[PDB]
Amino acid sequence: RLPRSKDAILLADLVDSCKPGDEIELTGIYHNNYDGSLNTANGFPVFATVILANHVAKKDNKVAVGELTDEDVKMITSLSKDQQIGEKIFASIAPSIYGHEDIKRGLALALFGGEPKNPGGKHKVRGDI
Amino acid sequence: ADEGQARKSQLQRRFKEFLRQYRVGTDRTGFTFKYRDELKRHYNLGEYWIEVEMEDLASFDEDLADYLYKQPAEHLQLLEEAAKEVADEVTRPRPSGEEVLQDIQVMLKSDASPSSIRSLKSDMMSHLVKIPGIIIAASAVRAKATRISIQCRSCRNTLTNIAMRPGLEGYALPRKCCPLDPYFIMPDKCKCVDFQTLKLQELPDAVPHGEMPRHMQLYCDRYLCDKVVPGNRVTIMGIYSIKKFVGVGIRSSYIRVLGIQVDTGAVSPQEEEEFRRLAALPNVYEVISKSIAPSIFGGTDMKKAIACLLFGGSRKRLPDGLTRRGDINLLMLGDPGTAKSQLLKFVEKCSPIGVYTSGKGSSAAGLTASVMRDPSSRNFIMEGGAMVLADGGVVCIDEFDKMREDDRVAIHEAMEQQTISIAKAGITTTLNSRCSVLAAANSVFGRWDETKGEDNIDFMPTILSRFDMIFIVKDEHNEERDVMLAKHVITLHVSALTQTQAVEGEIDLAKLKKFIAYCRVKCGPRLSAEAAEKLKNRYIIMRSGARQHERDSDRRSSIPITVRQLEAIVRIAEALSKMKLQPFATEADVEEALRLFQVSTLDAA
Amino acid sequence: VDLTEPIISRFDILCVVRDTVDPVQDEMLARFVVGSHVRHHPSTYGVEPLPQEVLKKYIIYAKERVHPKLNQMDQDKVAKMYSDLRKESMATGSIPITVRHIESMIRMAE
Amino acid sequence: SEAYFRVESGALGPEENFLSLDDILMSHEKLPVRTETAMPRLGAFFNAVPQGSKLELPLWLAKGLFDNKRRILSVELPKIYQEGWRTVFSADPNVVDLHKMGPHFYGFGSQLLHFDSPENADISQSLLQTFIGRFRRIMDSSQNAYNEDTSALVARLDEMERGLFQTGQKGLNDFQCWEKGQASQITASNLVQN
């Protein structure tokens, strides 16, 4: 079936909260107003509608560094003190898969990733794995 | 109101005294009135503009600088009028034919750190802003009225010298003298200036992750017109403002430009002295070769070929009108992971004009030129592809083997004739494509497989002939080279933190770029007579060798050896001479050209 | 594999998984799979994992608030390793193209 | 002070300077002629060159062969000194490219008067009015183009006008160095390059 759609208005700081292709989660006021173009298109007193936005989240970016709390940072930095943190992270990738420890290790290294750099300001090399 | 006129007069007087009194220097050496002398020399040259630095204005009178930052639209008019009267008292008396005083455009610049397009929120409206970007489109110059005179259509009364507001905003004609719209604008009795709209794309460094690059409309005025072309990188100082002719209370925004800074051709005499010294010192060729891609270990002959490509030969127009290309076309076939793409990414950065394209990401129209319908006019218009955007420069086609054959066919005219002939949609022209093609590709079988021979190349002979030099850069395993290369790579990765210091026996990238531009515009060499004799004889021996190899194989070689290769050697020698700013190519220059082409010909054995 | 060298060499990490028979390992794997199926009803680890919410927070923290620098990595050791890795690869069938594998090691250390 | 100075150009005078490199290069430029009598042994150059032959040969050689009786050859003006190009100069002297139209335009034109052409007066008046028209732009550009690329300004100028431009630039640079105090320092000569 064809999908339905709605227009939404972002104001002030909510602009640039999303881009095309973003699976957003939008809170807003469902607002309606008279529209003569829709009236002549439908032949009835049909009112256009738009969502006056009040919050935009994303359903893939469920966590972000701009939302991390001091307690989250504290427990993260406490976990890093453990000498088993590498093994814990490797065991934590796809825990419902038995074995494949080398695969989990490689995927952890790719998931965290290296550091991009540009020595001399003239020669780029990627950081991603 | 008299109080308002008093305020305007006081601010104009303060700007006048800034332009009259500002000095640079010290009592230990001396003083020069910077803006007085700039006004005098520019007016006597007929330039009628100056470039007032905001930092200098702040040092003289901080309140004026703050007012000009917060309210530039109000105060730039006063500053321009102040500059006009200062120019009058500085230049008069003037000779015959120069009695009438001319208006002065006060451009301005700043040392402040720039903002960005996505940083331009609503609170920046009507303020001075300084943003970087790339010009992607440039309008043709059009006339905008600065003062008009309007005549009543019925009774022929006239209102004259009505001041038009600057920028894209217009003026409302009065509805009282007669009819409801009594007036028409007199086309003769009005004064107009050049204006030009541009589109400034956000810097690729500045685009946030996952976003498309934004772009901003610019308005350039008077002497800012044609100061920048598409493909240039600029810092634009201007006034963020609304156009003033879905939703209701919305107005489109643009930047009224008042200062353009090309972030990277008029060289200073000091820079010219430096370039002449560089051309004069004996090992400039090796210095340039070391300066090209200094982070890339080895590949010194390929770097030398890239040097010859960057400097290029000399275009020649012969008595019958036929033109010979000076540009050098360089193909780099070979194994993967061999810094070919990095060398292309260096050349794009280093060439005075440089355009980087992926072969797989390109199309025939997008490379040469596109014909598209203008949405606002219904006519078909021309759009420059990469080879037009790179005219007078280098095209870096990476992953060149991934193009479809019909798209590689499109560049045949532009590679050799250096023109793009178009006959589409009723518009028929011959654009210029005076550019060098630097291409990179991998073997047919991934790595170069020596057992399969000529099957490692899928390119046609016709397009292979158009490349001046063809490198088959094989990746040959060797423990000593591998150890030294790995040490170089690891130290390079460690050196990402050490302040970007320079190196002995090397030219900085910016200085090398400017030196290439200087040598390109200045020097066009030729061959010496005995050098031409040597090249003639060696060409005969080379052609005989190629013919005998083809006969022994009983198969035509993939890479041909033709008159284009002779002329390729000619223009390589001319490029080597142009590095040294010599009017002639010696036997040694031809010898180095033969050596480079022999490396590129062993790669075709 | 049927892939070519220019596309193989761009992958920093190559992984091979084989479903070879080994009855003790098959018993362990099958018991774990049945355990997962009964555990997740709608209703080699030895270390215990993090909770996945904690792991997401950990990853997103580490990718922004941390930028590992490189100052010393035993250059001669890595260079010797890469050189004889190239020597052995020349005789066999996987492709350490020159710098990409060196930089893969640098990226993995980071 | 005792700096090197080239032998000055005497091209505008009744006769050019013997030792002037500029005059030598100026007189090297070729000049169309018609030969009035056949010349043996010179068919290797242009065995006899026949009578009535059109030739282009150097101005020094034309002056050498030319006697006022017009016994050996007749001398014809180059196109840039004939009436159409004189009219082009009369239109606006500032836009013509005297660097491309012979680099020694005024010197060649002045020595072209030696052959006693019937339009010598027209040539002389054209040269004088061309110089008068171009003088103000030369003066302003030379005396106000401070510390910048002078290539576009100096491009369209003949060698005499280029010398005037360099004189004006030298005066400007001298005064600016004085005003900024750099003239007081004692410095090594240009020969420190060696």
Ligand SMILES: Nc1ncnc2c1ncn2[C@@H]1O[C@H](COP(=O)(O)OP(=O)(O)NP(=O)(O)O)[C@@H](O)[C@H]1O
């Ligand atoms: N000699 C070298 N010196 C320094 N870096 C090198 C060298 N050879 C390869 N590299 C690095 O290897 C990486 C890949 O280089 P690249 O520019 O893609 O070579 P390439 O031959 O064009 N790869 P491909 O597109 O598969 O042919 C980059 O990080 C380069 O800096």
Ligand SMILES: [Mg+2]
């Ligand atoms: Mg590539």
Ligand SMILES: [Zn+2]
């Ligand atoms: Zn009226």
